[PDB]
């Protein structure tokens, strides 16, 4: 029934999942995510913001699509300013879209950023990619690949493959992170690719790693 999300999307001609639907999906596979709900108004949002815990951040959720992001809403009375401002911000900057709502997102503590990817190679089919976030993939292209399904051995070794690995084993002002949780996530990522033929690619970016556990902060799922 998690697949309902992929079916409803395919039904509505969409070739990707909205930010919140994407997280719900990977969460159903046991990959930890930052907790969220999608605002259907300010009233729903503030209570939703009241519902999941503070502080809370707001974004934009529309199949269409810039200045659509806020930060640190501390108070349920205070929340009201930022939503209007976004819907106030969007129209002046950009005119048209079906707005499913505004995302009410849980705050994520700072940590070591990671990248977990899923692509489909013509030869080998679903392949999982790993690398550390920031400049280490965007700039240096320091990534590793394993063809799914992933064994625990595959997961462990592809993590140690990357040249930025030492950023996981503790360094200046940063304690070592939970490698087991990363291995777990990499294997479940591969599982998502093997099982769902209708997923063309998946980007877990950024993923934050803590001394215990990890959190997917943003998830991107393209369809086909």
């Amino acid at each position: 029934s998690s697949r309902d999300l992929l079916l409803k999307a395919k039904e509505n001609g969409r070739k990707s999942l909205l930010e919140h639907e994407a997280k719900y999906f990977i969460s159903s596979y046991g990959i930890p995510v930052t907790n969220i709900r999608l605002a259907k108004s300010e009233e729903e949002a503030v209570n939703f913001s009241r519902e999941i815990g503070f502080p809370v951040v707001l974004k934009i959720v529309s199949p269409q699509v810039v200045g659509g992001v806020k930060v640190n809403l501390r108070s349920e009375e205070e929340v009201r300013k930022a939503y209007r401002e976004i819907i106030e911000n969007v129209k002046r900057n950009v005119p048209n879209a079906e707005i499913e709502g505004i995302l009410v997102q849980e705050f994520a503590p700072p940590g070591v950023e990671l990248i977990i990817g899923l692509l489909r190679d013509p030869q080998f089919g679903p392949t999982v990619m790993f690398g550390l976030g920031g400049v280490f993939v965007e700039l240096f292209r320091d990534v590793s690949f394993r063809v799914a399904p992933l064994s625990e051995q595959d997961a462990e070794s592809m993590i140690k493959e990357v040249k930025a690995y030492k950023l996981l084993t503790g360094f200046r002002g940063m304690e070592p992170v939970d490698i087991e949780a990363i291995k777990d996530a990499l294997i479940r990522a591969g599982r998502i690719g093997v099982e769902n033929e209708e997923i063309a690619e998946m980007d877990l970016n950024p993923v934050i790693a803590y001394p215990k556990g990890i959190k997917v902060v943003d998830a991107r799922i393209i369809l086909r």
């Binding site: 030869q123 064994s151 625990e152 595959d154 592809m158």
Partner: protein
Amino acid sequence: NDLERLFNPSAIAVVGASKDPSKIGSQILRNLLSYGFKGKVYPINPTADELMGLKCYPKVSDVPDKVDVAVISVPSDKVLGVIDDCGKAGVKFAVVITSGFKEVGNEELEEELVRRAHSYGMRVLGPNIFGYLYAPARLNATFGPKDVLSGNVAFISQSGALGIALMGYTVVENIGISSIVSVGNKADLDDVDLLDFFDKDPNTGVIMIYLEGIAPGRGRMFIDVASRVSLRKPIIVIKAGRTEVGARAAASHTGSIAGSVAIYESAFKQSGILMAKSVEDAFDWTKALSWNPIPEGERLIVLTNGGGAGVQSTDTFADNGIYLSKPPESLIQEIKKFVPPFASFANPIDITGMAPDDWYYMGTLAALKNPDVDALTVLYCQTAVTTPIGVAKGIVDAIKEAGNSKPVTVGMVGGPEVAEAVSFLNKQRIAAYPTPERASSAMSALYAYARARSYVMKSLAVR
């Protein structure tokens, strides 16, 4: 699908043989007969009634026998016609020498060839190949060299000219062959099908592959199969297109799109495959894996006369992630009986340059007998004090008198006499090389395979 009848056919037909001995079909026919095929050979030609002293037939289906394999050597505009006759005759395998298919842009014709074959329950090798050879069946269905050294190495080549050349190179490098298979365009039968056969084949112990690319949607299966094979038999892949620019160059000559370099490398790791960057590496490793058991531990011992070769060896090993450790005291004390006190026992064990022949025998023997030694590399630098052949014989004797089977490579540096000694050792299936680095690279392949096998074992560990 079982390939037993392809490698061990009762009857084989050669379509395209001619009175002209120069034509390729006739070259194949000559190799079959000379190599000593013990089954039935049926030349097929529109006009001739007798070729090479054998009753010839105008068509395969006119043959009063069940033909297992048909080697097709006729122009592309005539191939489909022969396929139908072959299908009608119930031949199970069509080995298509013919060129002019996907590699030259005519992909439509290739897909038709395979389609029509399958409709008769017939399988296609190639097309665009130089044939295949299987030593255990005295079967040489190629237009390459008429002979090869017998052994346990299977060679699969996606390249034509290079493959047929390397076939001849195996003799120079003293590599024993069990099979040569040109796979060419891989329109149907590919490396996965062959790996399945060589997995089962008790005659094949090592598998070497020149690989430019695999078909779309075939890679997952490739890993599953290769991975299980690697558990019992080492696989060496010479990857054509290890670079972006080389990948595109291979894509052109092949007539297919170039796959991701990084992902191929990952697949090879997950399959427990050793990737060689060059022909020499492949053959040097192949030779070592074909003639040695896997080391059971990391207590590798290097034996040398003079530090020069030892240091080159230590550097080479380190480049391959292999680090020597201090030797067993039992060994040192055994060697200290003839070696001067000032000599170095840090591993590499230096027995000094002015060491005589018998010291190689005593030192090699002592090392192999010692239960705390897993593997041995012996390095020799020629001087007027020794004789290269006497050193080689000392090593041979020490292997036989150790009465065991531990991995061993030899590196010998010197003049014409060393070239002879090295040749001599390889003739006895002892991995010997003309430099210390290459000997150290060979031993490193034994360890690289051990670690590759271990990778796959852990990868298949049950949850």
